[model samples]
Target chain A: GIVEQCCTSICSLYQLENYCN
Target chain B: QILKELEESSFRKTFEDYLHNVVFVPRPSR
Candidate 1:
């Protein structure tokens, strides 16, 4: 729901991993 | 409550699994 595309979703998902991990 | 369960140790691992596996995986590496 947060993203409209796989690339964008991967961007959001990976961004969180870097910041949250 | 789901939020209440989120604090439990089991949820931690469950969420960890979900988080690391956006496409659903285990120990997946590029």
Candidate 2:
């Protein structure tokens, strides 16, 4: 489902941002 | 069957809802 992808991307993005900050 | 169909949708949506908090909002807000 698209929700899976949506959640995955959001999570991946969060991880990336956290690492950067 | 529409309600049954929706129930399935709701369960998946709920699991997604839980994962969302853990994945995106679990951390303390700054």
Candidate 3:
């Protein structure tokens, strides 16, 4: 699940805030 | 809409990086 894994990893590192939409 | 926003967001770089490095494996149909 590259999509899920990719999004989750990004969210975990970026705090799903300003960077994460 | 959400996908467009994601494209414009600052996270785009990180997202692209992940995509570039991510490996896609084939799985059998369920």
**The candidate that achieves the highest lDDT relative to the unseen native structure:** 2
Q: Using DockQ as the measure, which candidate wins?
A: 2
What DockQ results for candidate 2?
A: 0.10
The 10 consecutive residues of candidate 3 chain B with the worst lDDT sum are B21-30
In the order shown, what is each candidate's alpha-carbon RMSD?
Answer: 10.1, 5.7, 12.2
Candidate 2 per-residue C-alpha lDDT over B1-30 given as tens digits, one digit per residue, 9 for 90 to 100: 589998888998777676655554434355
Candidate 3 lDDT by residue in tens digits, A1-21: 435555544434433232233
Off by over 4 Å in 2: A1-21, B26-30
Clashing pairs in 2: none
Q: Which lDDT values do the candidates have, in the order given?
A: 0.46, 0.55, 0.47
lDDT of 2 by residue, A1-21 (tens): 223445455546555455332
Measured against the true structure, the TM-scores of the candidates, in listed sequence, are 0.27, 0.42, 0.24
Model 1 stretches with alpha carbons more than 4 Å out? A1-21, B1-7, B23-30
| DockQ values of all predictions | 0.04, 0.10, 0.07
Q: Sorted by DockQ, highest first, which candidate order results?
A: 2, 3, 1
The order by descending lDDT is 2, 3, 1
The clash numbers for all candidates, in the given order, read 0, 0, 0
